[PDB]
Design a protein around this ligand. Structure first.
Ligand code: HEA
Ligand code: HEA
Ligand code: DMU
Ligand code: DMU
Ligand code: DMU
Ligand code: DMU
Ligand code: DMU
Ligand code: DMU
Ligand code: TRD
Ligand code: TRD
Ligand code: TRD
Ligand code: TRD
Ligand code: TRD
Ligand code: HTH
Ligand code: CA
Ligand code: CL
Ligand code: CU1
Ligand code: CU1
Ligand code: CU1
Ligand code: MG
Ligand code: OH
Lengths: 535, 256
């Protein structure tokens, strides 16, 4: 019923965010499949201008079947719209809503022994702002946009003057979408912080709070500083476009590079906002399935705090070729290298946790171990990129695409899957089938590596970002990358089948704690699912 | 001229170096690659070992330790040492890249939607450079018989489609070229992988890069900041030639 959507309980809101994030995730993943269909071979075969002469529905279906090059006038605007749509959905409407909005709202209060959150009504509103933002982002795709077509082909970070000169109002709708996302995140962040500070159970001191609850707390602080700054940046785009300002227009005395400083001041924190809750989940999962308490609890907390703090002083590593002085480049290179120490270290603590344990290779543990490998592969190419002299070559190439799909995209995704399998029995009263979870893992693991590892080669060979088409020499590794993407997609559809099965006819969960004694936090103390009123 | 600065089928490495700066990038990246491949193999082998050795069937009773000070000190300092080492080789390379020397040849480049404009202020030469196959050359950004013919006529082949332009930026070998880069409308980015150079072309700003090409040939780049519908379709061709051939090219442009 629609008694779900009016609920103010943190558990119901958590579930709403997870399902919604999953659905938006499906839409955005489907964009990537279409993207990889076009990148599978050189020459444009799918995104043909000829499909525009048909209707919106007719044109859609025609563009899913390949044409010969001689019958396909390349439509670069569509490429640009799809990738911008993919990026914006992922960065604002998928992974943070799932990790922070979803698991954050469901589990943090349980972990700190809070029976309710500080602002249940505000929490419900945060969800609705998320949905409204999502709707506007999607609406922008069908709105008068650049080049006399629909949608904005401007990149997820919306650089002016391109974003400010894009025609139609598609771009204004996208800016409004992002405002609504920021508002949702800010309300959530205020809720999380106040709950964490005022509503811990008697006895629950700061040094006894589980790592996941900490990860959410730190993330919430990052949101309160970072998101208001983004709101500034995008309002200035909005006024340049509609209200006669020239913040980013040289003719009026503006500087487009100013936008980049402000955008990236949000933009770096954004990635740590994405991954910090995944760190929390990994810590809970590894401890449970290694049957061994987390190694260095206090260093783990402090490493998270240090990463949070330092993530505000590294932003211009996204701007090494934008015209930064040699002094600026050198500083940001060094600040970036520093943050690599607390971050890359937590990896050793996770391995030390496993060391000497009694390891059970259940589905959630597989995702967690996948995380350790893949986050390392991604983090390590980050180090390469921090070196401005080498970034000269790699910037705006597929090497960067490989990096971030490695540390961030797949890190957040493997953390999300780890959480779902870890917690689905607890949330639903029904258990997933073990063989299917493992099959999902191996399919996703092989698929994702086949998709993204060859993109390192494409970048080293000089393939730029945001290209509908590419020189014939890049064909081999684009083909492999596309096959990987198709296999990952297959694994995701299988996953959705697994979730449907689990929720409709999964084995009944009868235990409060269906794992083992080393799942020692408070949710495993409650029934499965927990009662409407906990503690 | 030999086509040198281009991607090669199935390639996994950098494009060939044709400048001292590109050489430095290749060495530095190769050095870091050794290190990060070592770190990755290490981390991977530790996980796989721990899972084999401490599997629940092999280690039935788990340990309970949460500390190991000497190991924690080692695993904190060693990363710090690794990064200081990298930074020590990396910063000089960076300083070399970004300190602009005295120019033998000066070119001013302007990015437009969707083509590049070149000016040689010392020579009073200017021209525009469009992709072969763009609307400017009669095409619509795709291969066709006409486009292949134009590629042939210009001294290329169908394999250089998306890379080759109707006109090239010509420079003499073993001379210091300083390129001043700006944008006319939106941000573009001017780059040549073989030279180890990239610089955004921002409206309202004039930014500088340098290179010295160490061998003759043809070298390609592609616009590296999303700039709208034909971002994929406004590449860069540099031809490095003898001093005499460069002079000959210059005289061809002189109006008497
Ligand atoms: C999960 C989020 C996340 C994380 C954690 C990281 C981690 C790192 N990132 Fe990455 N980055 C992104 C998300 C993330 N990145 C995104 C989204 C972009 C591009 C956005 C866009 O343009 O669209 C980007 C782009 C990006 C750039 C700009 C590239 C360009 O545009 O040209 C740079 C430059 O320095 C960089 C550097 C680094 C570094 C040095 C790390 C380090 O923190 C990594 C630390 C290292 C590891 C985790 C490896 C494991 C280490 C050990 C096991 C031992 C430790 C030892 C040592 C460090 C020596 N990143
Ligand atoms: C979390 C962030 C995230 C994620 C998960 C992904 C997922 C994927 N990305 Fe994405 N990507 C971005 C963020 C992300 N991307 C960004 C920011 C850009 C830049 C856009 C720009 O240029 O402006 C980009 C750009 C980008 C490019 C470069 C486009 C270009 O430069 O022209 C490509 C190329 O193949 C690509 C491919 C893919 C593929 C095949 C997948 C996936 O198909 C991989 C397979 C993964 C799955 C099948 C599982 C997905 C699961 C979820 C999403 C969780 C859903 C939630 C729940 C279940 C609760 N992406
Ligand atoms: C003394 C004599 C008085 C002269 C007065 C005449 C004023 C001329 C207006 C200039 O504005 C032009 O408008 C075009 C149309 O809006 C633009 O074309 C753009 O839009 C077209 C479609 O409208 C596309 O076909 C083009 O490719 C694209 O460049 C073009 O860039 C822009 O400069
Ligand atoms: C696509 C991602 C899927 C995310 C998985 C989310 C699983 C959580 C569903 C749990 O729903 C629960 O159903 C119970 C009755 O069965 C009741 C309970 O109050 C409710 O919360
Ligand atoms: C379950 C995963 C979903 C995967 C969907 C993948 C669809 C694959 C389409 C492949 O079609 C090919 O496209 C090429 C041009 O690119 C053509 O050259 C080729 O003749 C054609 O065969
Ligand atoms: C940089 C990459 C590193 C990746 C991490 C993986 C390596 C982890 C090695 C852990 O080393 C163990 O630490 C324990 C604690 O320090 C020691 O126990 C010792 O101390 C315990 C704590 O009091 C006692 O219970 C034990 O009996 C006593 O053997 C034990 O000997 C030692 O082997
Ligand atoms: O610290 C900085 O490190 C730079 C790199 O080590 C030095 O640059 C020095 O070394 C560079 C590379 O060897 C040269 O390009 C510079 O001219 C020279 O000042 C620079 O002085 C020094 O303050
Ligand atoms: C007293 C004197 C009065 C002034 C009279 C000047 C009249 C002639 C102006 C021509 O304008 C050009 O039109 C092109 C064709 O429309 C545009 O190409 C644009 O559009 C093409 C087709 O989409 C793209 O391929 C190009 O890259 C893109 O620059 C180009 O920008 C624009 O300058
Ligand atoms: C207008 C064609 C877009 C197709 C989207 C695939 C999902
Ligand atoms: C003669 C053309 C080859 C046929 C291959 C077309 C496959 C298109 C698959 C589209 C399915 C949507 C994901
Ligand atoms: C030559 C190495 C092949 C790598 C394939 C991606 C996994
Ligand atoms: C650990 C991540 C490494 C990703 C880079 C792969 C580069 C392959 C090097 C090939 C060089 C061929 C000459
Ligand atoms: C010269 C060495 C540069 C410092 C590297 C930063 C380490 C963290
Ligand atoms: C090589 C011929 C030199 C001609 C020279 O006068 C011109 O480049 C100046 O306009
Ligand atoms: Ca294609
Ligand atoms: Cl509540
Ligand atoms: Cu960053
Ligand atoms: Cu461009
Ligand atoms: Cu471009
Ligand atoms: Mg750029
Ligand atoms: O980032």
């Amino acid at each position: 019923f629609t008694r779900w959507f009016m609920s103010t309980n943190h558990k119901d809101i958590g579930v709403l965010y997870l399902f919604t994030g999953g659905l938006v995730g499906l839409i955005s993943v489907a964009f990537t499949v279409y993207m990889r269909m076009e990148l599978m071979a050189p020459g444009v075969q799918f995104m043909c201008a000829e499909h525009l002469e048909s209707g919106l529905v007719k044109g859609f279906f025609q563009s899913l079947w390949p044409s010969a090059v001689e019958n396909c006038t390349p439509n670069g605007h569509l490429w640009n719209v799809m990738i911008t749509g993919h990026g914006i959905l992922m960065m604002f409407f998928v992974v943070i809503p799932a990790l922070f909005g979803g698991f954050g709202n469901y589990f943090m209060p349980l972990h700190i022994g809070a029976p309710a959150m500080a602002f249940p009504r505000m929490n419900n509103l945060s969800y609705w702002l998320y949905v409204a933002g999502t709707s506007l982002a999607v609406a922008s795709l069908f709105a008068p946009g650049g080049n006399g077509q629909l949608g904005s082909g401007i990149g997820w970070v919306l650089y002016p003057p391109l974003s400010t000169s894009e025609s139609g109002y598609s771009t204004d709708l996208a800016i409004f979408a992002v405002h609504l996302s920021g508002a949702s995140s800010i309300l959530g962040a205020i809720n999380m912080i106040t709950t964490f500070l005022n509503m811990r159970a008697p006895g629950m001191t700061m040094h006894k709070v589980p790592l996941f609850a900490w990860s959410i707390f730190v993330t919430a602080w990052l949101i309160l500083l970072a998101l208001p700054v983004l709101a500034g940046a995008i309002t200035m785009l909005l006024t340049d476009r509609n209200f006669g300002t020239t913040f980013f227009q040289p003719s009026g005395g503006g500087d487009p590079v100013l936008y980049q400083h402000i955008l990236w001041f949000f933009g770096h924190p954004e990635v740590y906002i994405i991954v910090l809750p995944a760190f929390g989940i990994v810590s809970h999962v590894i401890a449970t399935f290694a049957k061994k308490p987390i190694f260095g609890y206090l260093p783990m907390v402090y490493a998270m705090v240090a990463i949070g703090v330092l993530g505000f002083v590294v932003w211009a590593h996204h701007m090494y070729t934008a015209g930064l002085s040699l002094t600026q480049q050198s500083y940001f290179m060094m600040a970036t290298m520093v943050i690599a120490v607390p971050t890359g270290i937590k990896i050793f603590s996770w391995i030390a946790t496993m060391w000497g344990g009694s390891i059970e290779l259940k589905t959630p543990m597989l995702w967690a171990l996948g995380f350790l490998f893949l986050f390392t592969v991604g983090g390590v190419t980050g180090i390469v990129l921090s070196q401005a002299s080498v970034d000269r070559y790699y910037h705006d190439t597929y090497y960067v695409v490989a990096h971030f799909h490695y540390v961030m995209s797949l890190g957040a995704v493997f953390g999300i899957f780890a959480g779902i399998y870890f917690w689905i029995g607890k949330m639903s009263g029904r258990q997933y089938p073990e063989w299917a979870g493992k099959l999902h893992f191996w399919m996703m693991f092989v698929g994702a590596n086949l998709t993204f590892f060859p993109q390192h080669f494409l970048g080293r060979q000089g393939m730029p970002r945001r290209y509908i088409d590419y020189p014939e020499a890049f064909a081999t590794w684009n083909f492999v990358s596309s096959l990987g993407a198709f296999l990952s997609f297959a694994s995701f559809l299988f996953f959705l089948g697994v979730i449907f099965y689990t929720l409709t006819r999964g084995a009944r969960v009868t235990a409060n704690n269906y794992w083992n004694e080393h799942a020692d936090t408070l949710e495993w103390t409650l029934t499965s699912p927990p009662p409407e009123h906990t503690f | 001229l030999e086509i040198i600065g281009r991607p090669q089928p199935g390639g996994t490495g950098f494009q060939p170096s044709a400048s001292p700066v590109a050489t430095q990038i290749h060495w530095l990246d190769g050095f870091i690659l050794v290190i990060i491949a070592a770190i990755t193999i290490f981390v991977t082998l530790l996980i796989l070992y721990a899972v084999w050795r401490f599997h629940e069937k092999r280690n039935k009773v788990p340990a309970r330790f949460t500390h190991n000070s000497p190991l924690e000190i080692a695993w904190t300092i060693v990363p710090i040492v690794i990064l200081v080492a990298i930074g020590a080789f990396s910063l000089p390379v960076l300083f070399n890249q970004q300190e602009i020397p005295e120019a033998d040849v000066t070119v001013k480049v302007t990015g437009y939607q969707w083509y590049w404009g070149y000016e040689y202020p010392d020579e009073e030469i200017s021209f525009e450079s469009y992709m072969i196959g763009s609307p400017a050359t009669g095409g619509d950004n795709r291969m066709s018989p006409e486009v292949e013919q134009q590629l042939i006529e210009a001294g290329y082949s169908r394999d250089e489609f998306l890379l080759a332009t109707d006109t090239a930026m010509v420079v003499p070998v073993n001379k210091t070229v300083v390129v001043q880069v700006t944008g006319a409308d939106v941000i573009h980015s001017w780059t040549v992988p073989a030279f180890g150079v990239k610089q955004d072309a921002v409206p309202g700003r004039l930014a500088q890069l340098w290179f010295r090409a160490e061998r003759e040939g043809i070298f390609f780049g592609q616009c590296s900041e999303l700039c709208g519908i034909s971002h994929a379709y406004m590449p860069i061709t540099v031809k490095v030639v003898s001093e005499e051939a460069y002079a000959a090219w210059l005289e061809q442009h002189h109006h008497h």
